């Protein structure tokens, strides 16, 4: 592409599979290279992030793989003193910064993405809102999530992981969830402090107090609301703080819930080869969704529960 001779020299050293991986990267990089009028090996770290973002990739995994290949090319270029500077600025990049490169095609998250994010989050309030929304504990006005108590979590733990949720408008509803979900919620329901900027605060105050109660989602004491149930704005703010840590713009209660549905669809698509209305029926049943007419909802789901989307996000898991 840009710097044809050098590129092809490096491609000669590769193993064809690697060459098939690199040809598209160099192709899509040509234009950023010609704009900056330099090769990738002289790019700065932020310029490398801008490049990878310009690839518009939908998973943190594909982003990690892309960065790795670029780092290999850069090591190569350093060894031959082609690079102006002699350090691999692609190696100085941190785990959160990669989420900047996730492009804007992305709307939904994969289960592996969820676990990685959770791992990077110091507060159990954050982990909990993410996980519980993923597994379907959202209600109308998030009533099922905001009324959730430690006792409900414990009972579920002693009940084959079946939560009895309370939506204020529609009433009671049962939901089987994972043990990870329940342990995370158990910790969240006992958390007394919340670390600002995901534990990377610069100023004098690093944490703030939460209210004293038995609810999983807890208001902050300063907010002047009661020591009882939290409002929907607490969930909005928790997700905002997460999005700011990872510098991403697609997270919404809706998209998280639907990511859960999509992951279930991926599993069933592996098991049974194709997604159809039986798969969608099964999803309605597993997440025990409130529907007036089953069939109306089955076809209403086709917009996001389909093969195009499952493949789009779960390709590598599919081995495609």
Author numbering: 1 to 320
Task: Give me lines lifted from the publication on this model.
Bacillus subtilis contains the SPβ prophage whose lysogenic state depends on the MrpR (YopR) protein, a key component of the lysis-lysogeny decision system. Structural characterization revealed that MrpR is a DNA-binding protein resembling the overall fold of tyrosine recombinases. MrpR has lost its recombinase function and the G136E exchange impairs its higher-order structure and DNA binding activity.
Crystals formed within one week of incubation, and we determined the structure of MrpR at a resolution of 2.9 Å by molecular replacement using the N-terminal domain (residues 1–105) of the MrpR Alphafold model and manually building the C-terminal part (residues 106–320). Two MrpR molecules were present in the crystallographic asymmetric unit. While amino acid sequence alignments of MrpR to tyrosine recombinases do not yield a high percentage of sequence identity (below 25 percent), structural comparison using PDBefold identifies the highest similarity to the structurally and functionally characterized tyrosine recombinases Cre from E. coli phage P1 (63,64), XerH from Helicobacter pylori, and the integrase (Int) from E. coli phage Lambda. We hypothesize that the observed organization of MrpR might be a crystallographic artifact since MrpR was not co-crystallized with DNA. This structural rearrangement would also generate a positively charged groove between the CB and CAT domains of MrpR suitable for DNA interaction.
